Design a protein around this ligand. Sequence first.
Ligand code: GYM
Length: 159
Amino acid sequence: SHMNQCPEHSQLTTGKEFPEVHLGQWYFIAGAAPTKEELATFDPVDNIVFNMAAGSAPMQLHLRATIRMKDGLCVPRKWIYHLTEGSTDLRTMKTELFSSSCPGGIMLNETGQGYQRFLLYNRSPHPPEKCVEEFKSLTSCLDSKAFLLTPRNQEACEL
Ligand SMILES: CCCCCCCCCCCCCC(=O)OC[C@@H](O)CO
């Protein structure tokens, strides 16, 4: 009894390197979900660039992003996250962080009311295609077979 596991995938754990090691910029590379409808929100997107910062209060992080839409428009977004000590989970729902096969990579798992999806980010806007192939392969194995790759043909919007 064998042949029933998915590729190796480790959740990020706490040590006190988290989260300073993750701050700075990131690019949205690809998403996977049980169905297309959890990825629908990303259909008109060319690229998204993000910046993560230390919050203002104690266990807090400022996220900024600018979405470059396929039509060329730029849409700014801002969110605040709350870490829990001992945990790498982000509270805005919960986001689990996982290590990635790609150097400079990171994968998120978003859980919520009757929806779920995996989202790949990297420091580089153009990581190796292998990295993306391994993420598709891993997520398909976890039953998120619907896949979207951001095209990243246009320049990042300012952030
Ligand atoms: C401090 C450790 C966290 C580092 C994670 C860096 C990845 C930053 C992106 C987080 C995106 C989550 C927001 C979200 O729901 O995505 C929807 C779109 O607007 C972008 O994917």
